[PDB]
Design a protein around this ligand. Structure first.
Ligand code: CLA
Ligand code: CLA
Ligand code: CLA
Ligand code: CLA
Ligand code: CLA
Ligand code: CLA
Ligand code: CLA
Ligand SMILES: CCCCCCCCCCCCCCCCCC(=O)OC[C@H](CO[C@@H]1O[C@H](CO)[C@H](O)[C@H](O)[C@H]1O)OC(=O)CCCCCCCCCCCCCCCCC
Ligand SMILES: CC1=C(/C=C/C(C)=C\C=C\C(C)=C/C=C/C=C(C)\C=C\C=C(C)\C=C\C2=C(C)C[C@@H](O)CC2(C)C)C(C)(C)CCC1
Ligand SMILES: CC1=C(/C=C/C(C)=C\C=C\C(C)=C\C=C\C=C(C)\C=C\C=C(C)/C=C/C2=C(C)CCCC2(C)C)C(C)(C)CCC1
Ligand SMILES: CC1=C(C/C=C(\C)CCC[C@H](C)CCC[C@H](C)CCCC(C)C)C(=O)c2ccccc2C1=O
Ligand code: SF4
Ligand SMILES: [Ca+2]
Lengths: 40, 41, 74, 165, 74, 142, 732, 123
């Protein structure tokens, strides 16, 4: 597990995770607060 | 040599200048240069 | 390969694909491959430019994804 | 007002853009039975459209004859006339997150520098320490200035390699 | 295999194969449905057959038909 | 050591022939002749294209490029650990012993070699082009 | 054996390959490199070469006048300039088929002819020319001038008439003479044409060489000028009812400041153009009397440059030690000249569309479009040369020890700062300018146009309101009459500037929308990027971590080998080579914005541009695709019309453009080895082996192919667009 | 370079040696009239049947042989400049010499135009 976690830390894996979370966050934000053209 | 301006080209000028400049003139230039370019030193 | 796919796209739309009507068939392009393909302009005016209308006007329709990809591809 | 930009609330074209756009979806709803998922969906698109085409006007979005909302960039114009929510306020929001991301990155870089083989902590990222530095960038503006007023944000010009002139 | 299996699954749950079977001519094949977000739901066009998705061009519906597949349980 | 003299009657390796060898330059301009001494009859690869059976003892092959001869030279010096030597036969017959032209293959230092093209300054101590402008002389050579 | 073709380069002369022929044409006008070149001889050769270029320009102009007179419709077009189409020349094509002979008979002729888009007609009318004789006389005159310059090239190259290097390095005087004589006495001289010939001709009154010494330009005469009452020359201006070339509505003024444009011609008034040249001429002559000569009173340039050092030492030694740098470097001077000429070449295009300076120029849309695009492109090539020669200066003629602490040496000190900061601006402009186009395109595709981001160009609208534009409603400066500036000009050009600026049928300060905002920022991206490429090459011209000895390797060298990873395109010639592409991309966007903004203006569908431009899809379908419909139909399986040549050129441009790719995508090696096989085949082929090549066939040089492909690439981009810009504007 | 059945068949190595170019011995002019007529007579063909006025009556053969004559003359000039740019030092076969080529070119120009006339007299 020490070496599996090392692999899950490599750049390609970490970037895949970080982006997925960021993408999902934006998607979910528009899902509940849609059409955000202005900050009102 | 007629009307007002005495140097108005004749109607056959195009039927001579265009043929000469584009077929005859270029051939002379290309051939003359070719000889100079290949001219030995 | 590009010319081959263009040759198939145009030949077929012009000489095969169409609707069988009473006495005659209506080809997608009305059988213009023969006289319009012997020149490079015909391949641009009667093929590229003429058939590019659908993709350039796909915006706003279910096909709008292809218009976006068409430019993205360029 | 501003540059001949009429408010979308008073913009007739904006109203037509609503009428014609909801009609184009109320003609795609007819070719479907009242309860089909196709129809539940097209009715949501009509509701969402009718909400957006009103949230915008209620936000006082000036739009031209086109009927499409326009944004004001000048801080004075945006502030003086209550158009700060567009561009102005959004500007700082990005700047804060942008500097946050950059500051956290440099914090990590300068920690792995020195540490054993700094080159192998850039490929196999130290997710633990990377997760202990993310929140440190929340008050990045406070820390960044404290570094300018201490000469530690930049490097001395006699320690940076330069190409032969 | 994963790719092939996914095609059958997408053609099992999110597809109009059964509707197409009854009227193959006037119904366009579709087996890709987009989520209703960022107005991307426009991509779900009326392929006919009580279905709003993306017209596929992979020839799988006609392949399944010639395999006998007559339901989304197969 | 005495600059070896070419024996133009040296058995040549066995090869059917290739559309990739000498052209008009060999006669109008010049050509080169590599020679070596094998221990056994072995197949080698020609720097021009193909395979050839080298003969036992003296061998002689002709090329139209020095790099081609040197290529075979390194091949023999490495694949067969031979010590090949090549010349430059001009159209008049003037053979010029090209390699090693000393007996000691270039890589090895040997007293009796003068220093040619040797600047005794750091590459970054060369003058500016303006100092050699209108002088028709390179900054490195000056 | 050794050849003679490359007389200047003995190395090329001794080259056994064919490269000697190719390079012999390239390294031909780089005398600084010629074998046995002295600085004085270089200057004398350049000075004579200048005369040769001046002979070509005048000979070129004479030919245009001759063909317009011998094969043109000037008098007919002059009678009806809003219906007759100016004829450039006749098409004597021994290959034309009968339908081609019929379709190209237009503009009123008896044979196939070519309508002109140069706009010489409108210009020659405005300046006084009315008949074909005026053209014949002018052509002969200019032809004689060309002959004179040609003799001068010979005279100034023959001992005793060859200027010394000292004369070539006499700056103070040269500038004084050029500013007072070349610029000033040539502007007052022009006012003399206008006041005496152009203005009278526009008011219907032949004042030619036959009656100029007897025709009073002004009714009062020189009396008002002598008495100081100069105002008399600005009374009774031509009324709005005036018709160009007619006494109808004609006035008596010779020099005035009405502003705006003549009503019928829709072009700047002649009197306002007369007083302009008079005013500028006075300034130029006075400015000419500044530098020192051989009398005493005057300014030594060196002193001025050395006396300008910031006391805070922020600019180091300031401009001290720069006079010699500019005076002893012919690349530094050429770069400044190209930069100045380039920038002014653009002013001509930006100020000639807004303010038509010639009669009936606006009416001719095709001319207007083809003139903007011509100058804007020529300007771009000139700018590339400016930086190009600047990089050559850094390597061939920069003394790092003399320029020590001067503003020029403290530039390389912060070379990274300048280059890196140009990188950030380019990225910022690029990431955002494009992002707000894709964002709008997505909204257009998803049928959510309201959601698309449309930022308003408020900053530009205010500069427009400041000039008097009222549409915006900002009431700023001229927009507000109660202002100081507005009230001050109210008695001069103001009354006209407004009438004209507040008319939407012309191009004076056109209404800008959010569509213009995006394209303007895109133009900035091209300006910054193209600049970054050239600036990076100029600063790294003689230095770089990868190639610290670039100066020793000269300016144009292929690469430093595959060593250090890759040195491909590392020479400062390759910053030019690459910058050219970005320059074409930048100008492409600017000349496409002009054309669409104006085609929509001329067709009356301004909303078309005000909406389609917001998203990129509109630019392609509504502009390139929609307008190309006619051009492509120049020749179809049913027939051909007068737009056949443009359709043929349009495709021809694509061919040359694509051919350029091979020389850029493919590299020297596959071709070289291929040529080797070809050489073998010919030597073996019987009956053909008899004939042989004198020069050994070799593949194009690494740098050579770069320029050959780029010339093909550029020629295409020009012909392909010239075809569109002219056949789409004319077709309607 | 690789003696192949093709580039060795004594029949084909003999056919080549009777062609008026490998037949060294015949005076270069007579080795030019031979080659000239051979390359000149067949030239009119392509212009007579597929040229601009190929479907006009009577003037389809005069125009073919007139055009051919034109090219024949063009071919002559190229032959001449070739010798001038190849025999600067007037480099066995006298054809491969300065004077040799100047007499071959002339034989070709007077043989090809004679062949072009033979083809018109054969229509
Ligand atoms: C750089 C200026 C310039 C240019 C670009 C052209 C271009 C052209 N001329 Mg022209 N010409 C010019 C100057 C020029 N001319 C001058 C100054 C004169 C007065 C001597 C003439 C007198 C002239 C005549 C009489 C004719 C042309 C013709 C032509 C066209 C046939 C092509 C050709 O080269 O024929 C050859 C043309 C010449 C050899 C004369 C030009 C010689 C000048 C001095 C060189 C410049 C062509 C488009 C022909 C035409 O009109 O076709 C319809 C024709 O009949 N030109
Ligand atoms: C990014 C560059 C930029 C640009 C091109 C402009 C451009 C403009 N700004 Mg501005 N502004 C900027 C940055 C910029 N601003 C920033 C960073 C701030 C925050 C400090 C402001 C805060 C600001 C204010 C408070 C106001 C402007 C205003 C204006 C407009 C007229 C003011 C002027 O003459 O000059 C530019 C002025 C400034 C840059 C700041 C000084 C404030 C000005 C001088 C007071 C002028 C008030 C008066 C009503 C303006 C008359 C405009 C005319 C059409 C009637 C003008 C189009 C005026 C406006 O039109 O709003 C109603 C105004 O009131 N700006
Ligand atoms: C800690 C990461 C980091 C930071 C703080 C910066 C900071 C900077 N970069 Mg940079 N850059 C980065 C990463 C980073 N970069 C990476 C990974 C690349 C390769 C794609 C680049 C490529 C790049 C270029 C080509 C340029 C800059 C430029 C700049 C300067 C202009 C400011 C700007 O707008 O940012 C610009 C940032 C970018 C253009 C792209 C980077 C954006 C990424 C997403 C941020 C990095 C996040 C990082 C992975 C977080 C690590 C966290 C850690 C726990 C693992 C600026 C000081 C410009 C410059 O030199 O100014 C003179 C410029 O020309 N950067
Ligand atoms: C610009 C903002 C934006 C955002 C936030 C999203 C977000 C999303 N899109 Mg979308 N899209 C956009 C723009 C955007 N899109 C545009 C401009 C277009 C036109 C070209 C599309 C066309 C599009 C299509 C056709 C589809 C999506 C789909 C999706 C969803 C899943 C993505 C996916 O299928 O990956 C793929 C995920 C996997 C393959 C699983 C990964 C397993 C690994 C790789 C093995 C997701 C919530 C999909 C969807 O709607 O889901 C039903 C989908 O069908 N988008
Ligand atoms: C009154 C004295 C005088 C005058 C009139 C000139 C004039 C000239 N000199 Mg000169 N010179 C002088 C004194 C003078 N010199 C002295 C005393 C010296 C000794 C130091 C020199 C040393 C010298 C050198 C070494 C050189 C010159 C050169 C030149 C020519 C520049 C090339 C050109 O075309 O410019 C023309 C520019 C204008 C006429 C005005 C510029 C206006 C801009 C560019 C555009 C304006 C366009 C307008 C707005 C609209 C036009 C519309 C329509 C007409 C198209 C030019 C004709 C160069 C040369 O020989 O070229 C052949 C050059 O090499 N001179
Ligand atoms: C009055 C303007 C002017 C002048 C006097 C020069 C003069 C010179 N340039 Mg230059 N140049 C200019 C404008 C000018 N340039 C502009 C506007 C550009 C941008 C497009 C360039 C880009 C440029 C480059 C990239 C190079 C030069 C080079 C040179 C030098 C040798 C090349 C040459 O002229 O032979 C003849 C040049 C040609 C025949 C061009 C070949 C292909 C062209 C496009 C075909 C044109 C045929 C007519 C020479 C002293 C070369 C150099 O610096 O020497 C080391 C070189 O590398 N120039
Ligand atoms: C359509 C073709 C094209 C495009 C789009 C570009 C674009 C660009 N060129 Mg360029 N160029 C081209 C052709 C092109 N060039 C050609 C044919 C040549 C001749 C060889 C050159 C020669 C050239 C030179 C010499 C230079 C440039 C430079 C630049 C950059 C200028 C700075 C900028 O605007 O940053 C803006 C950034 C963008 C527009 C990128 C958009 C953001 C990306 C696409 C999103 C991130 C990825 C996304 C999420 C998904 C994609 C990846 C995913 C699949 C993983 C820019 C990105 C300059 C440079 O390098 O900058 C320092 C420069 O030096 N170019
Ligand atoms: C997802 C969980 C995968 C299994 C896991 O994480 O531990 C998997 C653990 C530890 O996984 C790795 O094991 C290897 C040695 O066998 C490595 O060298 C390391 O010890 C360890 O990282 O090993 C397993 O139990 C094999 C599980 C296979 C599934
Ligand atoms: C008001 C405002 C705008 C006004 C802009 C105007 C008028 C002027 C702008 C000047 C600007 C934007 C910038 C000048 C910057 C100059 C310097 C020297 C600053 C450099 C910043 C640096 C070096 C910091 C880098 C960072 C550090 C060290 C750590 C982290 O913070 C990350 C990072 C990289 C940010 C407009 C355009 C209208 C629009 C509306 C917002
Ligand atoms: C041709 C032409 C042109 C060109 C031009 C140029 C470039 C130049 C010219 C020039 C000229 C042709 C000029 C004129 C001159 C004349 C004169 C100049 C005369 C005068 C007279 C008198 C009598 C006066 C005297 C005096 C003076 C001088 C000074 C003061 C005093 C007095 C007044 C006494 C163009 C292209 C535009 C187009 C059209 C054609
Ligand atoms: C095609 C190609 C060749 C081969 C191209 C050759 C050999 C050019 C052949 C041209 C012949 C001679 C005909 C050209 C016709 C010209 C239009 C004639 C006039 C050209 C000038 C005199 C103006 C290269 O050598 C090369 C080298 C490096 C990078 C890319 C390439 C590359 O792409
Ligand atoms: S590929 Fe060509 S340009 Fe690149 S390093 Fe090698 S030789 Fe030089
Ligand atoms: Ca007159």
């Amino acid at each position: 597990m020490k070496n599996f976690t090392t692999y899950l830390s490599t750049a390609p894996v970490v970037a895949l995770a970080w982006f997925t979370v960021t993408a999902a966050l934006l998607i979910e934000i528009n899902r509940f607060f849609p059409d955000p053209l202005v900050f009102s | 040599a007629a009307g007002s301006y005495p140097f108005v080209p004749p109607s056959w000028a195009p039927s001579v200048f265009v043929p000469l400049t584009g077929l005859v003139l270029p051939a002379i230039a290309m051939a003359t240069l070719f000889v100079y370019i290949e001219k030995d030193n | 390969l590009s010319i081959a796919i263009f040759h198939f796209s145009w030949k077929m739309q012009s000489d095969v694909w169409g609707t069988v009507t009473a006495s005659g068939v209506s080809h997608i392009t009305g059988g213009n491959f023969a006289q319009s393909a012997n020149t490079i302009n015909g391949w641009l005016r009667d093929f590229l430019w003429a058939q590019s209308s659908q993709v350039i006007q796909s915006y706003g329709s279910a096909l709008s994804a292809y218009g976006l990809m068409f430019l993205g591809a360029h | 007002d501003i540059a001949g930009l009429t408010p979308c609330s008073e913009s007739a074209a904006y109203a037509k853009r609503l009428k014609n756009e909801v009609k184009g979806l109320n003609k795609r709803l007819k070719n479907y039975e009242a309860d089909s998922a196709p129809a539940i969906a097209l009715k949501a698109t009509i509701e969402r459209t009718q909400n957006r085409f009103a949230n915008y006007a209620k936000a006082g979005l000036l739009c031209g004859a086109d009927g499409l909302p326009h944004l004001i960039s000048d801080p004075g114009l945006a502030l003086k006339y209550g158009h700060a929510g567009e561009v102005f306020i959004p500007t700082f929001g990005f700047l804060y997150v942008a500097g946050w991301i950059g500051y956290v990155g440099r914090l990590y870089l300068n920690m792995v520098k020195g540490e054993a083989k700094p080159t192998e902590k850039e490929i196999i990222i130290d997710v633990p320490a990377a997760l202990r530095l993310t929140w440190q960038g929340a008050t990045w503006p406070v820390q960044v200035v404290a570094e300018l007023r201490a000469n530690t944000l930049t490097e001395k010009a006699e320690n940076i390699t330069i190409s032969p002139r | 295999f994963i790719w092939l299996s996914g095609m059958y699954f997408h053609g099992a749950r999110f597809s109009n194969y059964e509707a197409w079977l009854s009227d193959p001519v006037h119904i366009k094949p579709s087996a890709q449905v987009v989520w209703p977000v960022v107005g991307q739901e426009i991509l779900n066009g009326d392929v006919g057959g009580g279905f709003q998705g993306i017209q596929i061009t992979s020839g799988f519906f006609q392949l399944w038909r010639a395999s006998g597949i007559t339901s989304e349980l197969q | 050591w005495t600059e070896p003299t070419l024996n133009p009657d040296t058995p040549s390796p066995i090869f059917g022939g290739s559309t990739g060898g000498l052209l008009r330059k060999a006669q109008v301009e010049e050509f080169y002749v590599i020679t070596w001494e094998s221990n056994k009859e072995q197949i080698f690869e020609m720097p021009t294209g193909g395979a050839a059976i080298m003969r036992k003892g003296p061998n002689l092959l002709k090329f139209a490029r020095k790099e081609q001869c040197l290529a075979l030279t390194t091949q023999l010096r490495t694949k067969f650990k031979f010590t090949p030597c090549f010349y430059r036969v001009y159209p008049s017959g003037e053979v010029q012993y090209l390699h090693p032209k000393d007996g000691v293959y270039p890589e090895k230092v040997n007293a009796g070699r003068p220093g040619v093209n040797q600047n005794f300054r750091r590459i970054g101590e060369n003058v500016n082009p303006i100092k050699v402008k209108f002088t028709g002389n390179g900054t490195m050579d000056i | 054996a050794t050849k003679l073709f490359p007389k200047f380069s003995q190395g090329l002369a001794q080259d056994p390959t064919t490269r000697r022929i190719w390079f012999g044409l390239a390294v031909a006008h780089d005398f600084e490199s010629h074998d046995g070149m002295t600085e004085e001889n270089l200057y004398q050769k350049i000075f004579a070469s200048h005369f040769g270029q001046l002979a070509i320009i005048f000979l070129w102009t004479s030919g245009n006048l001759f063909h317009v007179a011998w094969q043109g419709n000037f008098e007919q077009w002059g009678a009806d300039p809003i219906h007759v189409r100016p004829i450039a020349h006749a098409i004597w094509d021994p290959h034309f088929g009968q339908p081609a002979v019929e379709a190209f008979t237009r503009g009123g002729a008896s044979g196939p002819v070519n309508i002109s888009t140069s706009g010489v007609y409108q210009w020659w009318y405005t300046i006084g020319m009315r008949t074909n004789q005026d053209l014949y006389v002018g052509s002969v005159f200019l032809a004689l001038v060309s002959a004179i310059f040609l003799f001068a090239s010979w005279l100034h190259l023959q001992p005793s008439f060859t200027p010394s290097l000292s004369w070539f390095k006499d700056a103070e005087s040269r500038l004084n003479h050029h500013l007072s004589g070349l610029f000033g006495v040539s502007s007052l001289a022009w006012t003399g044409h206008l006041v005496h010939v152009a203005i009278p001709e526009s008011r219907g009154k032949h004042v030619g060489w036959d009656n100029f010494l007897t025709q009073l330009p002004h009714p009062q005469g020189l009396t008002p000028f002598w008495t100081g009452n100069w105002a008399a020359y600005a009374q009774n201006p031509d009324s709005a009812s005036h018709v160009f070339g007619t006494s109808d509505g004609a006035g008596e003024a010779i020099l005035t400041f009405l502003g705006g444009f003549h009503p019928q011609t829709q072009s700047l008034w002649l009197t306002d153009m007369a007083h302009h040249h008079l005013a500028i001429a006075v300034i130029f002559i006075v400015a000419g009397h500044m530098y020192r000569t051989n009398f005493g009173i005057g300014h030594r340039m060196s002193a001025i440059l050395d006396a300008h050092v910031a006391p805070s030492g922020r600019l180091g030694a300031g401009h001290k030690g720069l006079f010699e740098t500019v005076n002893n470097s012919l690349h530094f001077q050429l770069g400044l000249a190209l930069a100045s000429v380039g920038t002014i070449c653009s002013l001509v295009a930006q100020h000639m569309y807004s303010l038509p300076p010639y009669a009936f120029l606006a009416n001719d849309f095709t001319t207007q479009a083809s003139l903007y695009t011509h100058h804007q492109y020529i300007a771009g090539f000139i700018m590339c040369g400016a930086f190009a020669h600047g990089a050559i200066f850094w390597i061939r003629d920069y003394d790092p020890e003399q320029n020590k602490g001067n503003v020029l040496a403290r530039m390389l000190d912060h070379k990274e700062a300048i280059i890196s900061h140009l990188s950030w601006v380019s990225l910022f402009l690029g990431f955002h300018t494009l992002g707000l186009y894709v964002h709008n395109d997505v909204m257009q595709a998803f049928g959510t146009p309201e959601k698309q981001i449309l930022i308003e160009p408020v900053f530009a609208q205010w500069i427009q309101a400041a000039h008097g534009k009222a549409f915006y409603g900002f009431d700023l400066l001229l927009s507000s009459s109660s202002s100081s500036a507005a009230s001050a000009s109210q008695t001069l050009w103001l009354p006209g500037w407004l009438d004209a600026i507040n008319n939407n049928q012309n191009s004076l300060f056109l209404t800008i929308g959010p569509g213009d905002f995006l394209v303007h920022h895109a133009i900035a991206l091209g300006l910054h990027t193209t600049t970054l490429i050239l600036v990076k090459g100029a600063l790294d011209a003689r230095g770089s971590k990868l190639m610290p000895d670039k100066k020793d390797f000269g300016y144009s060298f292929p690469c430093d080998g595959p060593g250090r990873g890759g040195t491909c395109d590392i020479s400062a010639y390759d910053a030019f080579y690459l910058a050219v592409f970005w320059m074409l991309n930048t100008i492409g966007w600017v000349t496409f914005y002009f054309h669409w903004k104006h085609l929509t203006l001329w067709q009356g569908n301004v909303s078309q541009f005000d909406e389609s431009s917001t998203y990129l899809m509109g630019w392609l379908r509504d502009y390139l695709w929609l307008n190309s419909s006619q051009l492509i139909n120049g020749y179809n399986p049913f027939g051909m019309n007068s737009l056949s040549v443009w359709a043929w050129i349009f495709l021809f441009g694509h061919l040359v453009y694509a051919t350029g790719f091979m020389f850029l995508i493919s590299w020297r090696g596959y071709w070289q080895e291929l040529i080797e096989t070809l050489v073998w085949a010919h030597e073996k082929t019987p009956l053909a082996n008899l004939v042989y090549w004198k020069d050994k066939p070799v593949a194009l040089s690494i740098v050579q192919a770069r320029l050959v492909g780029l010339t093909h690439f550029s020629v295409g981009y020009v012909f392909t667009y010239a075809a569109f810009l002219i056949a789409s504007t004319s077709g309607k | 370079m690789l003696e192949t059945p093709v580039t060795s068949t004594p029949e084909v190595a003999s056919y080549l040696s009777n062609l008026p170019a490998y037949r060294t011995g015949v005076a270069p002019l007579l080795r030019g009239v031979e080659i000239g007529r051979a390359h000149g007579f067949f030239l009119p063909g392509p212009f007579i049947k597929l040229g601009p006025l190929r479907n006009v009556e009577g003037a389809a053969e005069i125009a073919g042989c007139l055009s051919a004559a034109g090219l024949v003359i063009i071919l002559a000039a190229a032959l001449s400049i070739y010798g001038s740019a190849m025999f600067q030092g007037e480099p066995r076969d006298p054809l491969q010499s300065a004077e040799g080529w100047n007499e071959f070119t002339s034989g070709f120009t007077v043989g090809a135009l004679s062949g072009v006339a033979w083809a018109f007299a054969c229509t």
